[model samples]
Target: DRPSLCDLPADSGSGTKAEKRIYYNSARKQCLRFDYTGQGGNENNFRRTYDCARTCLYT
Candidate 1:
């Protein structure tokens, strides 16, 4: 069982532990990113640098 792309917790500011996000592109059948954002810069990294994956959570 894995977390869906949209099934996320609030984006705690950097340095805080965050949840894992499964970003994908269905049209290409790709799981572009599969990791926890807690260890990274931004969890809500879906805009501005808007290369966000929209398939898994297209609901």
Candidate 2:
């Protein structure tokens, strides 16, 4: 299936905390890292840049 998250913006989170995470930036058609925390972020968030690229970039 087409990845819906691939075109969405990276949402680190809306709470208090900091975790390094990767997300797909459809605007630039690339993956980028950001600080993830708490919850409420979109599915675009990824654990590794490679995974992000695999799903968003490669797709």
Candidate 3:
């Protein structure tokens, strides 16, 4: 089964609360999907700006 957005750890170091919302929104818009097992910790560098953007918005 696919992972739901809510399943993601609230404190995955994605960003702050507002930032995280933004990141989530951006991801939704871009149809972004994250595979924790495949790409965990790799997003720390912003390789996925869209995801980062969403994270920033929520954080």
Best by TM-score: 2
Model number with the top lDDT: 2
Provide TM-scores for the models.
0.25, 0.84, 0.21
Off by over 4 Å in 2: none
TM accuracy, model 2: 0.84
Candidate 3 structure quality by residue, lDDT tens digits, 1-59:
22245233322343333222222333343323333322233323233656554544343
Which prediction has more favorable TM-score, 1 or 3? 1
- Best-to-worst order by TM-score is 2, 1, 3
Residue 56 displacement (Å), model 3:
0.8
Clashes of each: 0, 0, 22
Count of clashing pairs, candidate 2: 0
Candidate number with the higher TM-score (1 or 2): 2
The models' CA-based lDDT, in order, is 0.42, 0.83, 0.35
Compose the digit string of candidate 1's lDDT tens values, residues 1-59.
Answer: 22354344334345555554544443554444444546554343343222443433332
